Write a protein that holds these residues in place. Structure first.
Motif, PDB file in Angstrom:
ATOM      1  N   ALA A  64       0.806  -1.023  -0.122  1.00 14.23           N
ATOM      2  CA  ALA A  64      -0.081  -0.184  -0.091  1.00 14.23           C
ATOM      3  C   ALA A  64       0.862   1.238   0.057  1.00 14.23           C
ATOM      4  CB  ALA A  64      -1.086  -0.032   1.085  1.00 14.23           C
ATOM      5  N   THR A  65       1.884   1.288   0.810  1.00 14.95           N
ATOM      6  CA  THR A  65       2.593   2.648   1.059  1.00 14.95           C
ATOM      7  C   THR A  65       3.655   2.689  -0.297  1.00 14.95           C
ATOM      8  OG1 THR A  65       4.604   1.506   2.264  1.00 14.95           O
ATOM      9  CG2 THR A  65       2.610   2.450   3.630  1.00 14.95           C
ATOM     10  N   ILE A  66       3.878   1.681  -1.011  1.00 13.80           N
ATOM     11  CA  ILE A  66       4.695   1.578  -2.183  1.00 13.80           C
ATOM     12  C   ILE A  66       3.828   2.081  -3.173  1.00 13.80           C
ATOM     13  CG2 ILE A  66       5.775   0.305  -3.865  1.00 13.80           C
ATOM     14  CD1 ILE A  66       7.088  -1.298  -1.623  1.00 13.80           C
ATOM     15  N   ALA A  67       2.560   1.603  -3.100  1.00 18.48           N
ATOM     16  CA  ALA A  67       1.411   2.101  -4.464  1.00 18.48           C
ATOM     17  C   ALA A  67       1.166   3.394  -4.010  1.00 18.48           C
ATOM     18  CB  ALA A  67       0.324   1.160  -4.136  1.00 18.48           C
ATOM     19  N   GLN A  68       0.983   3.983  -2.773  1.00 16.08           N
ATOM     20  CA  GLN A  68       0.743   5.443  -2.476  1.00 16.08           C
ATOM     21  C   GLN A  68       1.769   6.441  -2.861  1.00 16.08           C
ATOM     22  OE1 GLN A  68      -2.540   6.690  -1.377  1.00 16.08           O
ATOM     23  NE2 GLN A  68      -1.402   8.168  -2.739  1.00 16.08           N
ATOM     24  N   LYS A  72      -2.291 -17.328  -7.493  1.00 18.66           N
ATOM     25  CA  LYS A  72      -1.210 -17.214  -6.600  1.00 18.66           C
ATOM     26  C   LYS A  72      -1.183 -15.862  -5.847  1.00 18.66           C
ATOM     27  CE  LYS A  72       1.190 -21.173  -7.856  1.00 18.66           C
ATOM     28  NZ  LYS A  72       1.804 -22.057  -6.767  1.00 18.66           N
ATOM     29  N   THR A  73      -1.822 -14.987  -6.321  1.00 21.31           N
ATOM     30  CA  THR A  73      -1.626 -13.896  -5.635  1.00 21.31           C
ATOM     31  C   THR A  73      -2.624 -13.853  -4.583  1.00 21.31           C
ATOM     32  OG1 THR A  73      -1.407 -12.340  -7.955  1.00 21.31           O
ATOM     33  CG2 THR A  73      -2.141 -11.385  -5.886  1.00 21.31           C
ATOM     34  N   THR A  74      -1.983 -13.186  -3.509  1.00 20.77           N
ATOM     35  CA  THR A  74      -2.907 -13.356  -2.187  1.00 20.77           C
ATOM     36  C   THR A  74      -2.983 -12.079  -1.311  1.00 20.77           C
ATOM     37  OG1 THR A  74      -0.793 -14.159  -0.955  1.00 20.77           O
ATOM     38  CG2 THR A  74      -2.580 -15.681  -1.737  1.00 20.77           C
ATOM     39  N   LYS A  75      -2.090 -10.770  -1.923  1.00 19.08           N
ATOM     40  CA  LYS A  75      -1.891  -9.822  -1.150  1.00 19.08           C
ATOM     41  C   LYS A  75      -2.146  -8.585  -2.245  1.00 19.08           C
ATOM     42  CE  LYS A  75      -0.831 -10.964   3.249  1.00 19.08           C
ATOM     43  NZ  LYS A  75       0.000 -12.224   3.216  1.00 19.08           N
ATOM     44  N   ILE A  76      -2.974  -7.541  -1.713  1.00 20.73           N
ATOM     45  CA  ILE A  76      -3.079  -6.272  -2.476  1.00 20.73           C
ATOM     46  C   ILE A  76      -2.878  -5.049  -1.273  1.00 20.73           C
ATOM     47  CG2 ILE A  76      -5.664  -6.066  -1.795  1.00 20.73           C
ATOM     48  CD1 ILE A  76      -6.100  -5.054  -4.867  1.00 20.73           C
ATOM     49  N   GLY A  77      -2.305  -4.027  -2.063  1.00 14.48           N
ATOM     50  CA  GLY A  77      -2.109  -2.930  -1.536  1.00 14.48           C
ATOM     51  C   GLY A  77      -1.912  -1.680  -2.361  1.00 14.48           C
ATOM     52  N   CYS A  78      -3.028  -0.824  -2.155  1.00 12.45           N
ATOM     53  CA  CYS A  78      -3.263   0.411  -3.006  1.00 12.45           C
ATOM     54  C   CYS A  78      -2.926   1.750  -2.512  1.00 12.45           C
ATOM     55  CB  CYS A  78      -4.529   0.376  -3.675  1.00 12.45           C
ATOM     56  SG  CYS A  78      -5.285  -1.449  -4.240  1.00 12.45           S
ATOM     57  N   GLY A  79      -3.039   2.566  -3.434  1.00  9.09           N
ATOM     58  CA  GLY A  79      -2.824   4.011  -2.997  1.00  9.09           C
ATOM     59  C   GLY A  79      -3.549   5.035  -4.195  1.00  9.09           C
ATOM     60  N   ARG A  80      -3.759   6.178  -3.865  1.00 10.48           N
ATOM     61  CA  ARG A  80      -4.653   6.957  -4.469  1.00 10.48           C
ATOM     62  C   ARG A  80      -4.622   8.487  -4.291  1.00 10.48           C
ATOM     63  NH1 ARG A  80      -9.160   8.379  -1.143  1.00 10.48           N
ATOM     64  NH2 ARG A  80     -10.733   6.869  -1.867  1.00 10.48           N
ATOM     65  N   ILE A  81      -4.679   9.387  -5.211  1.00  8.98           N
ATOM     66  CA  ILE A  81      -4.889  10.821  -4.974  1.00  8.98           C
ATOM     67  C   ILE A  81      -5.612  11.339  -5.954  1.00  8.98           C
ATOM     68  CG2 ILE A  81      -2.846  11.218  -6.692  1.00  8.98           C
ATOM     69  CD1 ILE A  81      -1.800  13.318  -4.665  1.00  8.98           C
ATOM     70  N   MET A  82      -6.237  12.676  -5.694  1.00  8.22           N
ATOM     71  CA  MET A  82      -6.970  13.572  -6.576  1.00  8.22           C
ATOM     72  C   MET A  82      -6.153  14.774  -6.652  1.00  8.22           C
ATOM     73  SD  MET A  82     -10.979  12.575  -5.466  1.00  8.22           S
ATOM     74  CE  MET A  82     -11.565  14.193  -6.244  1.00  8.22           C
ATOM     75  N   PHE A  83      -6.049  15.178  -8.167  1.00  7.17           N
ATOM     76  CA  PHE A  83      -5.711  16.646  -8.230  1.00  7.17           C
ATOM     77  C   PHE A  83      -6.245  17.319  -9.311  1.00  7.17           C
ATOM     78  CE2 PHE A  83      -3.367  15.530 -12.127  1.00  7.17           C
ATOM     79  CZ  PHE A  83      -2.988  13.845 -12.057  1.00  7.17           C
ATOM     80  N   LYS A  84      -6.230  18.441  -9.574  1.00 10.84           N
ATOM     81  CA  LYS A  84      -6.316  19.296 -10.737  1.00 10.84           C
ATOM     82  C   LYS A  84      -5.482  19.113 -11.929  1.00 10.84           C
TER      83      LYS A  84
END
Length: 216
Positions: A85-89, A168-180
């Protein structure tokens, strides 16, 4: 730490955390907002992925170029992973719509899905963007399940769907932002990292279960 990943060095790649060392987002992210997620939202994302995974796994998704998608022997629920998640973010905080060069971890290669959507002034959910990743199943062929193809045209047509349903994938980690964005529209940017990474050139996506001869 993240600069000694043989994973990267092998791939002649600079790691996202190794390069972008700042938690504050980059100059691309003009008048930004809504970094990261509430915990409500994190469950939203995990739950959607499992719903979809379970659907395909149970032999219920019926779309595909060559006919319906068969059920899976094993298809584990994804659990949320804060490292990914923190790497995605961090990569999300750079507001450049493309995949990063490398995002791997000590445990495994890490996969990735990307989405961005726009609006004049934004009411778009990640679930919406995930459904759109999954909707690639319209272009998917049964025959690619047991061994992932080498072709890149295919990776592009269906790669986001195949990563979602990667047994085989068992873990998810996401990140997100909004901007103009430069035209004042509000862009809503989602990056999801998956562990271990799917779309392994040659591997099966999942193990094709067969319906019993003696269940009438």
């Amino acid at each position: 730490n993240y600069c000694n990943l043989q994973s990267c060095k092998r791939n002649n790649a600079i790691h996202t955390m190794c390069q972008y060392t700042s938690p504050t987002p980059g100059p691309m992210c003009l008048e930004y907002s809504n970094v990261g997620f509430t915990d409500a939202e994190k469950d939203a994302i995990v739950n959607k992925h499992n719903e979809l995974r379970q659907r395909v796994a149970s032999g219920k998704e019926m779309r595909g170029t060559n006919g319906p998608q068969p059920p899976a022997v094993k298809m584990p629920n994804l659990t949320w992973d804060p490292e990914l998640a923190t790497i995605a973010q961090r990569w999300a905080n750079q507001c450049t719509f493309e995949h990063d060069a490398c995002r791997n971890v000590e445990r495994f290669a890490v996969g990735q899905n990307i989405a961005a959507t726009s609006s004049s002034g934004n009411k778009s959910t990640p679930n919406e963007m995930i459904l759109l990743w999954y909707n690639e199943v319209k272009d998917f062929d049964n025959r690619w399940i047991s061994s992932f193809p080498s072709d890149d045209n295919i990776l592009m047509k269906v790669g986001h769907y195949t990563q979602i349903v990667w047994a085989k994938t068992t873990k998810i980690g996401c990140g997100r932002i909004m901007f103009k964005e430069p035209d004042n529209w509000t862009k809503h940017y989602l990056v999801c990292n998956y562990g271990p990474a799917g779309n392994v050139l040659g591997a099966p996506i999942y193990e094709i279960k067969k319906h019993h001869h003696h269940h009438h």
